[PDB]
Amino acid sequence: RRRTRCRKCEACLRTECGECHFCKDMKKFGGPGRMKQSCIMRQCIAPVLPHTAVCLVCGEAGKEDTVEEEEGKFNLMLMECSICNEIIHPGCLKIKESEGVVNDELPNCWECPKCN
Ligand SMILES: [Zn+2]
Ligand SMILES: [Zn+2]
Ligand SMILES: [Zn+2]
Ligand SMILES: [Zn+2]
Incomplete structure (x- = not known):
């Protein structure tokens, strides 16, 4: 399912790195917003x-x-x-x-x- x-672990609390291939794709970083994935540094631990x-x-x-x-x-x-x-x-x-x-x-x- x-x-x-969780919104409480190190990964969830940290800001988007702006450098990984997913951040680079995000509109907020000036990208087209097509991949729609989360920052690779923000993969929730639990x-x-x-x-x-x-x-x-x-x-x-x-x-x-x-x-x-x-x-x-x-x-x-x-x-x-x-x-x-x-x-x-x-x-x-x-x-x-x-x-x-x-x-x-x-x-x-x-x-x-x-x-x-
Ligand atoms: Zn029950
Ligand atoms: Zn079962
Ligand atoms: Zn990132
Ligand atoms: Zn988390």
């Missing part, structure tokens, strides 16, 4: 789900901030499966024979219980 830049992302079961967004207990917090996070690409709250899925495996390098990312 398509994701958006892209996040889009603001419209919701759980495929309950149709709600992340609610991890409303809960303080760690298990409950995790279960109200949106998690996207890296294998089947479903976005869900882990608490909206009950499976006996499997649990999911969280990926710590990307936000809201796991292999869900259906795929693991």
